[PDB]
Write a sequence for this structure.
């Protein structure tokens, strides 16, 4: 079924196969499957999503932060300086339980203190002196 | 050590602590000629089945025995040449003893040498063990002795001995004989008592004939030196032992 | 490799070979024991005899290497003598060089340290044996030491060895917690012998002769085997 | 005779991490616990033995060992591969430094040459490494008190307060909190002592433990009094009651 | 599936008198997959394609852009080299990547640097080996 | 068994499971994979001949050397490989001068090759009890040739297996059998040097992969008068010249 | 013996025509630390980014990603330090040998073709591994003035301008490939280093304990160069002058 | 069938006890040609035929001098013979300038038997794969011995080896009490010791050059009758 | 593997010996090179694979490598092994000049360094020299030009031109076309424009990459200046006008 779709785009419909159909594709681990598929035939741009930058993560933290509350007393970027390149996907995580931690004690109003907490919630527990190398 | 295992190469203790490259050897000697060693009450005597494998062989021409410096008789079994090797070491080292300490060689300290040269061919990886089962017995001021030899070095001091393809057969008589003689026989009479063995042991191999040879060493008969026996002595024996087994 | 040779460990963090060499020591189903005194020690080793052609004076697991010193082996013989021989040859060195005779401790600081070397450079397989010693030194008194295929040599108050060094000891440590003594009394070289024989037969319950057992005692400028007619002196008890 | 100069351990696996090294220290972690720390005015090292059977004496087997009157060390790993290399080590200090100069060596470089005992073994033909990662403590005059770890490769690190062995990680996780930048000795030994007692069951008898220090000279032990240019041996261990009276304090 | 092979393996050669036919095929890898069906009684020969030579590559691409502007003349002959073992087909990609780079323009304008920005780009994805031993 | 060779090839000094050891025979093949040679017995002289594998038109083919003298009155050809052949030459000619020093006469030829064919058994075992010098055997079938007193005009055929036979004519290369047949039914007992030199070329025009000239074969002669030498191209371009009329029909 | 002691995989080739143990070793380094070395007109520098940074680990007495050879040459080691203290013990003698017979100091092009020729020496002879190492060099002479070199575990040395090694380096060059002029005074070099290292590593916090570097100059007119390894306080000076 | 291991080297016993490589050596000589002989009380003989490659080529040399009071033949590999021969000349030479009470035959076997032993236990090396025949003469008279790579030297009247040999030894066993009773008639036992070699072969023409003999006795020094002087003895 | 004859010893059933053909199968991955001898001159050439403009231009370890005033050496592929052959050749030069009181030939030199490799592939515990080299230069007081090519199997074979390494087969066919044993180039500049032109197919007009010497009678050795080269790189391209 990979052998057919590869040809389904070529030499029988190939005059019009990829004419006006304009596929995309989303994966991980590009370096294990066939090299037949990634090539200019059937593909154009092996483009890439790295983790974000410090400036990126501020935006992405500011945006799942929308609907929370009539908050105050915040500078929501220094958290990004607390937090190295992890993802622009998990930060909703630390954006989430910050509310929960205050929800846990019923103050619907929020604080910077919780962001300091929830950020440390995830990876400090997700953590060998054999440095034979120099 | 059945396959994908350990028996193939030396100095690898199989997990029951064994060198299965060794215990293959004792089957080799078990697949060889017969020979014996007896303690007279005043010395020793040996024997062997020489093996006619053809008609073109000459009596008293190709022995199966060598000898130590002056006294210590030594026999072979299983494989001859590997035996012949260390007997060159036998005559060798005993001269290093004699030149140095100004006397002949005692037999216990002798095995203290020859019971290690073979042991020191067990422990490496790039050698083979001597596929034999040797015997040597002799005389000294402290009396006489007999020593059997196993390739792993498990040499003890016997009064009677055996090897070859006729062990349980032969050694039975050696046990069934000695209990009837706690005295310990003198020399000339144990001879025919032993030739009784070989013309009985060969019962396995009745496809063929054979012959034998004899050793001799005692105080009252050689001053305690080694030699063979000829003339009417052993000829009076071979017919005797052949006479009293029919 | 990793399961055949020695000089490469397992992935785990140990090896497998030498753990076997300890095992061949039990390849003769023999038991032994050794004890102390103010001036005396004892060693013993039950002797088996298959087919009766042997010369039981020639049979021996014991090698009095020198004056002041004594040893007995375990496991098989031929891989023991070479461990005994260079021992004997060594006392022709320490004496000729450092004046006087070897204590045990320097010896079982030495005869082991090369057994370690027999498991770095694997060209020589390690000697298939655990091995003991006895003596009556001058500073520390009658001292015992144990040795082994890899060298955790240790002094002792007493020992136990064979296939059954789990309960023979239990028949012994039972009362060195009671009598409150590493030492043992009845100093003379007889009375301590029956102690060694009575407690083991209490652990075994088998009768003997001079034929099947032996003796070895460390004494000043002395070490030797002897006649074991004193099997009788146990008889007077019950 | 010995036809096996074939270099063991010389086969880099494709990841680049060697084979037996990462297996060798798989032992030392499986081995017993030890430690040794540092202060401003003195040093200490200690561990425990695990006799493993009662009748065996437990004072002849000195796990701690001397190599100079100013240096002393301990391990926790394999035993018989320790007592052989010290005999090389202390021999070196007579040879490589003393006979040629006269003095005893500093410890910026004794450890270096003790490392060279080790890498020459993980690189020649058919030789396993020594299953030990020991540590030494010593005193000098360009640097005074000091401490060093080693490892069966050869990489020596310096340290301040360290454990290696079974539960060392728990101890390294322990020291640094109740440690102090100037924890002088008689509290050091305490925190050191209890630093082990958590790491052990069975019994904590005073005879169970050895330890020692490098402090200040003690020419009551020097014997040959009558020479002002003969300072005291700065190293000296302790017996089993003067440990067992700091122990009654807890 | 084996039965799907047999009759065809049969229908091929079971047919004789191929006065007119040419039953042919092709793939991307054979050296570990196909049977030992090969016999001139069944199949005769086998002919290879693979990566091109430089002068082979030289025939390729102005002819593409012959149907294209080249606002300016940008000496493509020094653009590529035999050392970079391109595909044969990253080059129509090249030819359009630059107009894409003019699709990153209001200018519909041809430039050498656009090709420069492309092969630097596309080969950032393509592999590269270590010149460790300088072998 | 299933694999008699592959399961016992890697053991250089190991006899087969059927008797004839291996790495010698693996060493006895590649002589064919190289380039042929040929030589002939004769009482008024001796001839040798080869090809030279004119690979490209850049190689100055006078520079290649499948042929060389040992001494004044001995010459050797080669085959197969050539890097592994200098060493025997550099040992072989050493004996002749030495024989011309310790004994001061001229050396025989049968007293030579024995001290050449022994040399290629140092691997595994040794010749006169000595242990070993070199890893592997080395494959070049040589063709010595030389006058002497006791026997006159001779040749031998070396072989790394340690064997050698006093052929009266013998070839090398993959074309050996393809021609050695042709010589067997052609070699008489009372021929001349020249017609032999005319003979040998018949094979080279026959066997060779391409049309030959000066720069595709060369030759070398023997005389008790001159000893040993070779033939330059124009001389080679003359025995081939008047070759043809003998095959005009 | 041979059939079971794999002494064959060393010092041999692929069928595709290459080596394994070396392409492994050259890769094996990249698990290790990181260092750089450049060539300013005024003088020379180096640097090293450790990774061993346990807080109680003493990291202030002496150093391990950097060593010396003599009074005018220095290096920046990378590899495993059990395989560094030997050839260095073979290098330091070499200067104390070259002087000892020619009463001058080393033309620095000569010794790297004395150190490389023991690294090569093992990956042809024997069945031994190579030294798993890569070096930097930094030295001065008169028949070439300043210099800088780079080596490998095989034995292939190279002269280079401004280099990184160890980890994550192929971008590091590409992080500076724009920034390297040729004027290059000293105090506009160190700004590149931190601008290099502070954009590639684990934690941008970058405690001084996790950093070492050195320097070379010409401070006495018509005089030798000043070997100076910097020590913590003066390391920390420029560390914060930059404002980080 | 199926592969065996334990052959890879000359050091491993089999599970039974064989040195499986050794037998593969001894394989070659039955795979090789024949060289035989017999004994008189005053004389004793070697004889062996030849091989070739083509008719252009000469034949192999197969019987080799070692002294006047000894000589030998071979059947198998050519190199190993020279090793022993170039070795063997030395001892019969060595005794002739140190004791000059000339070397006897039997002890020669008893030391080169021990040659092969040393080269059949170690690793690095290889077994000399030949079973050769040998003669001699001494105060004890003439003799005849046999060789194997095992080290099993055996003193005998006569013997055959090589391919197609069985009938010839079998002829000899059938013809035993006759050829040896003679003395001073060397040229008649050979006439039985040739038709012996007429047992199993093709030889459809004048075997003039295919064949060679030497002999010694109480008077006869070791000399190899070769060439057409042999042709009468056909 | 002290001794051990690992697989260098093991011949093939085809006849070859694996690790040798493997070697010069590895050599082609390295920088090309070239040699020419004309009427009176001898010429050489190499390349520098493209660096990032950091590969130190001043003291690069180059491909030409002198021996004396009258001999040089160029090579291909591996480099750490190149540096010893260059040493234990010129060693023998200073020696040969001494104990014979007169300098080397070239037919004495190629025999050595082509014979050495055979010992590094017919011995134990040794890997071959994964390298291929050529020699170039005159004998003393002789106008004759000579170059000899040699490769790890140990054979040396003279030439008039030859190329080694990468994409040589893309090149040497150009040279057999132009160069001919008919008639040399006249003199120096003739060989060079012929020499350089042949490279250009693998060159991307990197004039910096390529580096050249010549050799002349009376040992007038010299390397040439990038400007002198580059002004050939262009006028040759000026001739492209068709």
């Amino acid at each position: 079924v990979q052998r057919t779709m590869l040809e389904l785009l070529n030499q029988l419909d190939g005059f019009e196969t990829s004419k006006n159909i304009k596929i995309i594709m989303a994966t991980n681990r590009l370096d294990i499957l066939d090299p037949a598929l990634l090539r200019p035939g059937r593909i154009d741009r092996k483009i890439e999503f790295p983790p974000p930058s410090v400036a990126a993560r501020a935006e992405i933290l500011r945006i799942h932060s929308r609907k929370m509350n009539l908050t105050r007393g915040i500078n929501l970027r220094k958290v990004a300086e607390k937090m190295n390149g992890c993802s622009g996907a998990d930060v909703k995580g630390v954006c989430t339980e910050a509310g929960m931690y205050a929800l846990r004690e019923r103050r619907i109003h929020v604080t910077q203190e919780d962001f300091e907490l929830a950020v440390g919630k995830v990876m400090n527990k997700n953590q060998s002196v054999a440095k034979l190398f120099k | 050590s059945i396959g994908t295992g350990y028996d193939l190469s030396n100095s690898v203790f199989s997990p029951d602590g064994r060198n299965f490259q060794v215990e293959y050897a004792v089957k080799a000697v078990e697949n060889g000629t017969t020979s014996i060693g007896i303690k007279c009450n005043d010395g020793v005597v040996f024997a062997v089945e020489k093996l006619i494998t053809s008609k073109l062989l000459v009596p008293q021409k190709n022995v199966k025995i060598q000898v130590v410096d002056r006294h210590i008789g030594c026999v072979y079994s299983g494989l001859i040449p590997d035996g012949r090797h260390l007997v060159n070491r036998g005559r060798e080292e005993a001269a290093s003893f004699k030149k140095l300490y100004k006397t002949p060689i005692p037999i216990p300290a002798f095995a203290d040498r020859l019971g290690q040269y073979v042991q020191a061919h067990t422990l490496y990886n790039s050698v083979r063990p001597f596929g034999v089962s040797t015997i040597f017995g002799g005389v000294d001021k402290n009396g006489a002795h007999l020593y059997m030899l196993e390739p792993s070095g498990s040499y003890w001091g016997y009064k009677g001995a055996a090897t070859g393809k006729g062990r349980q057969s032969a050694k039975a008589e050696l046990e069934k004989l000695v209990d009837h003689h706690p005295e310990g026989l003198s020399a000339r009479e144990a001879v025919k008592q032993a030739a009784k063995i070989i013309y009985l042991a060969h019962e396995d191999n009745k496809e063929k004939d054979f012959e034998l040879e004899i050793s001799w060493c005692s105080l009252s008969e050689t001053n305690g030196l080694h030699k063979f026996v000829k003339g009417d002595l052993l000829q009076e024996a071979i017919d005797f032992a052949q006479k009293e087994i029919n | 490799g990793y399961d055949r040779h020695i000089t490469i460990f397992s992935p785990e963090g140990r090896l497998y070979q030498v753990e076997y060499a300890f095992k061949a020591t039990n390849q003769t189903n023999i038991n032994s024991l050794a004890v102390r005194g103010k001036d005396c020690t004892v060693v013993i080793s039950q002797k088996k005899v298959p087919d009766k052609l042997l010369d039981p004076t020639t049979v021996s697991y014991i090698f009095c290497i020198s004056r002041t010193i004594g040893m007995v082996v375990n496991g098989p013989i031929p891989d023991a003598r070479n461990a005994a021989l260079r021992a004997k040859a060594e006392a022709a060195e320490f004496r000729y060089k450092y004046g006087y005779d070897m204590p045990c401790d320097v010896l079982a600081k030495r005869m082991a340290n090369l057994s370690q070397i027999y498991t770095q450079r694997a060209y020589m397989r390690p000697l298939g044996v655990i091995l003991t010693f006895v003596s009556v030194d001058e500073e520390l008194g009658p001292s015992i030491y144990k040795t082994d295929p890899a060298g955790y040599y240790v002094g002792y108050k007493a020992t136990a060895t064979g296939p059954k060094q789990q309960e023979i000891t239990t028949n012994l440590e039972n009362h060195f917690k009671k009598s409150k003594i590493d030492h043992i009394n009845e100093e003379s070289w007889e009375k301590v012998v029956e102690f060694a024989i009575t407690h083991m037969i209490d652990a075994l319950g088998t009768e003997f002769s001079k034929n099947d057992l032996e003796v070895g005692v460390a004494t000043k400028d002395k070490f030797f085997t002897l006649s074991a007619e004193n099997i009788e002196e146990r008889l007077v008890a019950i | 005779m010995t036809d096996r100069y074939s270099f063991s351990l010389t086969t880099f696996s494709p990841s680049g991490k060697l084979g037996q090294i990462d297996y060798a220290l798989t032992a030392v972690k499986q081995g017993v616990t030890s430690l040794g720390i540092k202060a401003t005015n003195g040093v200490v090292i200690a561990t425990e033995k695990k006799s493993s059977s009662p009748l065996a004496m437990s004072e002849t087997l000195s796990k701690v060992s001397l190599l100079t009157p100013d240096i002393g060390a301990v391990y926790s790993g394999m035993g018989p591969d320790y007592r052989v290399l010290v005999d090389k080590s202390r021999k070196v200090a007579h040879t490589s430094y003393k006979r040629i100069y006269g003095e005893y060596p500093p410890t910026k470089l004794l450890v270096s040459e003790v490392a060279k005992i080790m890498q020459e073994a993980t690189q020649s033909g058919g030789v396993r490494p020594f299953g030990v990662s020991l540590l030494i403590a010593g005193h000098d005059e360009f640097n005074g008190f000091s401490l060093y770890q080693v490892d069966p490769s050869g990489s020596y690190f310096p340290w301040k307060a360290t454990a290696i062995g079974k539960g060392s990680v728990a101890a390294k996780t322990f020291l640094e909190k109740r440690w102090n930048d100037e924890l002088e000795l008689e509290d050091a030994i305490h925190i050191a002592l209890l630093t082990l007692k958590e790491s052990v069951e069975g019994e904590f008898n005073g005879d169970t433990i050895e330890l020692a220090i490098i402090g200040d000279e003690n020419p009551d032990l020097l014997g040959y009094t009558g020479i002002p240019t003969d300072k005291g041996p700065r190293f000296r261990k302790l017996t089993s009651q003067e440990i067992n009276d700091r122990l009654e304090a807890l | 599936i084996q039965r799907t092979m047999l009759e065809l393996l049969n229908q091929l050669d079971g047919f004789d008198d191929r006065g007119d036919v040419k039953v042919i095929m092709a793939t991307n890898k054979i050296e570990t997959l196909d049977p030992a069906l090969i016999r001139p009684g069944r199949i005769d020969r086998k002919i290879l394609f693979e990566n091109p030579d430089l002068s082979t590559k030289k025939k390729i691409l102005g002819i593409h852009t012959s149907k294209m502007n080249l606002s300016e003349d940008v000496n493509l002959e020094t653009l590529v080299t035999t050392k970079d073992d391109l595909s044969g087909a990253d080059i129509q990609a090249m030819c359009t990547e630059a107009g894409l780079l003019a699709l990153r323009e209001r200018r519909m304008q041809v430039t050498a640097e656009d090709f420069k920005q492309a092969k630097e780009r596309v080969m950032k994805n393509k592999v590269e080996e270590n010149l460790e031993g300088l072998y | 068994m299933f694999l008699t060779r592959s399961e016992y090839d890697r053991g250089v000094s190991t006899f087969s499971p059927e008797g004839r050891l291996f790495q010698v025979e693996y060493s006895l093949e590649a002589i064919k994979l190289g380039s042929t040679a040929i030589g002939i017995a004769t009482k008024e002289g001796v001839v040798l001949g080869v090809e030279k594998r004119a690979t490209s038109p850049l190689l100055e083919s006078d520079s290649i050397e499948k042929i060389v003298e040992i001494d004044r009155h001995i010459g050797c050809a080669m085959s197969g490989l050539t890097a592994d052949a200098r060493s025997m030459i550099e040992h072989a000619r050493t004996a002749a001068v030495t024989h011309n020093l310790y004994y001061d006469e001229d050396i025989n030829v049968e007293s030579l090759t024995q001290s050449v064919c022994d040399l290629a058994l140092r691997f595994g075992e040794g010749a006169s009890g000595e242990e070993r010098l070199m890893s592997r055997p080395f494959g070049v079938a040589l063709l010595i040739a030389g006058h002497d007193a006791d026997d006159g005009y001779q040749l031998f055929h070396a072989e790394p297996s340690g064997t050698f036979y006093r052929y009266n004519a013998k070839a090398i290369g993959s074309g050996s059998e393809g021609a050695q047949a042709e010589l067997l039914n052609e070699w008489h007992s009372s021929l001349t040097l020249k017609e032999a030199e005319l003979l040998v070329l018949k094979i080279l025009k026959q066997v060779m992969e391409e049309k030959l000239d000066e720069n595709n074969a060369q030759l070398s002669c023997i005389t008790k008068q001159d000893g040993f030498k070779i033939y330059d191209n124009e001389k080679t371009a003359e025995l081939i010249k008047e070759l043809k009329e003998k095959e005009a029909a | 013996m041979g059939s079971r002691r794999y002494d064959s995989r060393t010092t041999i080739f692929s069928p595709e025509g290459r080596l394994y143990q070396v392409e492994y070793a050259l890769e094996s380094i990249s698990h290790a630390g990181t260092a750089i070395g450049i060539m300013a007109s005024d003088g020379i520098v180096l640097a090293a980014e450790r990774k061993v940074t346990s807080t109680l680990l003493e990291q202030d007495t002496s150093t391990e990603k950097l060593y010396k050879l003599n009074d005018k040459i220095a290096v920046a080691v990378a590899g495993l330090t059990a395989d560094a203290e030997i050839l260095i013990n073979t290098a330091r003698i070499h200067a104390q040998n070259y002087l000892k017979t020619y009463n001058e100091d080393i033309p620095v092009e000569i010794l790297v073709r004395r150190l490389s020729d023991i690294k090569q020496g093992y990956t042809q002879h024997g069945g031994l591994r190579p030294f798993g190492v890569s070096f930097i060099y930094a030295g001065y002479d008169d028949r070439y003035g300043y210099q800088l070199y780079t080596s490998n575990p095989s034995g292939n040395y190279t002269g280079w301008k401004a280099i990184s090694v160890g980890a994550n380096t192929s971008a590091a060059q590409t992080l500076l490939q724009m920034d390297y002029k040729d004027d290059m005074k000293v105090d506009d070099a160190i700004e590149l280093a931190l601008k290099t290292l502070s954009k590639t590593t684990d934690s941008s916090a970058l405690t001084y304990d996790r950093l070492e570097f050195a320097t070379i100059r010409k401070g006495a007119n018509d005089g030798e160069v000043y070997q100076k390894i910097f020590k913590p306080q003066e390391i920390k000076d420029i560390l914060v002058k930059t404002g980080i | 069938m199926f592969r065996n291991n334990y052959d890879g080297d000359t050091v491993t016993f089999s599970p039974t006890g064989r040195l499986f490589q050794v037998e593969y050596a001894l394989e070659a000589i039955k795979q090789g040609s024949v060289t035989v002989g017999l004994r008189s009380n005053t004389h004793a003989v070697l004889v062996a035929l030849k091989r070739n490659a083509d008719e252009l080529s000469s034949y192999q040399k197969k019987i080799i001098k070692c002294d006047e009071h000894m000589g030998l033949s071979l059947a198998g590999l050519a190199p190993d013979a020279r090793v022993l021969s170039n070795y063997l000349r030395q001892q019969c030479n060595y005794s002739s300038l140190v004791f000059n009470r000339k070397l006897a035959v039997e002890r020669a076997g008893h030391l080169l038997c021990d040659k092969a032993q040393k080269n059949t236990q170690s690793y690095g090396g290889r077994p000399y794969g030949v079973g050769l025949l040998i003669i001699g003469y001494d105060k004890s008279g003439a003799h005849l011995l046999e060789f194997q790579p095992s080290g099993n030297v055996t003193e005998l009247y006569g013997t055959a080896i090589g391919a197609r040999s069985q009938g010839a030894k079998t002829y000899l066993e059938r013809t035993l009490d006759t050829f040896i009773k003679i003395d001073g008639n060397p040229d008649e036992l050979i006439k039985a010791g040739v038709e012996a070699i007429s047992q199993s072969l093709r030889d459809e023409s004048l075997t003039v050059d295919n064949l060679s003999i030497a002999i010694v006795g109480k008077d006869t020094p070791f000399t190899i009758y070769d060439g057409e002087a042999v042709a009468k003895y056909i | 593997m002290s001794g051990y004859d690992r697989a260098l010893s093991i011949f093939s059933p085809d006849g070859h010996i694996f690790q040798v053909e493997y070697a010069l199968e590895a050599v082609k991955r390295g920088t090309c090179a070239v040699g020419v001898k004309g009427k009176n001159c001898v010429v050489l050439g190499c390349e520098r694979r493209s660096t990032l403009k950091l590969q130190d231009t001043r003291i690069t370890p180059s491909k030409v490598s002198k021996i004396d005033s009258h001999v040089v050496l160029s090579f291909s592929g591996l480099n750490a092994d190149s540096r010893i052959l260059i040493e234990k050749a010129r060693v023998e030069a200073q020696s040969h000049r001494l104990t014979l009181e007169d300098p080397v030939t070239v037919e004495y030199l190629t025999r050595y360094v082509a014979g050495v490799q055979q010992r590094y592939t017919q011995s134990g515990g040794v890997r071959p020299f994964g390298v291929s080299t050529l020699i170039a230069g005159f004998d003393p007081r002789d106008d004759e030009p000579k170059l000899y090519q040699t490769e790890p199997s140990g054979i040396y074979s003279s030439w008039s031109a030859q190329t080694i390494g990468r994409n040589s087969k893309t090149v040497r066919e150009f040279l057999e076309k132009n160069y001919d044993r008919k008639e040399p180039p006249a003199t120096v500049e003739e060989c060079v424009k012929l020499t350089v032109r042949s490279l250009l197919e693998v060159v991307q007009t990197g004039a910096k990459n390529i580096e050249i010497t010549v050799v002349k009678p009376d040992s007038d050795i010299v390397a040439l200046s990038s400007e002198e080269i580059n002004q050939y790189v262009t006028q040759i391209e000026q001739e492209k006008q068709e």
Remarks:
- Chain D has one domain: 1-249.
- The CA atoms of residues 76 and 184 of chain D lie 25 Å apart.
- The domain at 1-249 of chain D is CATH 3.60.20.10 (Glutamine Phosphoribosylpyrophosphate, subunit 1, domain 1).
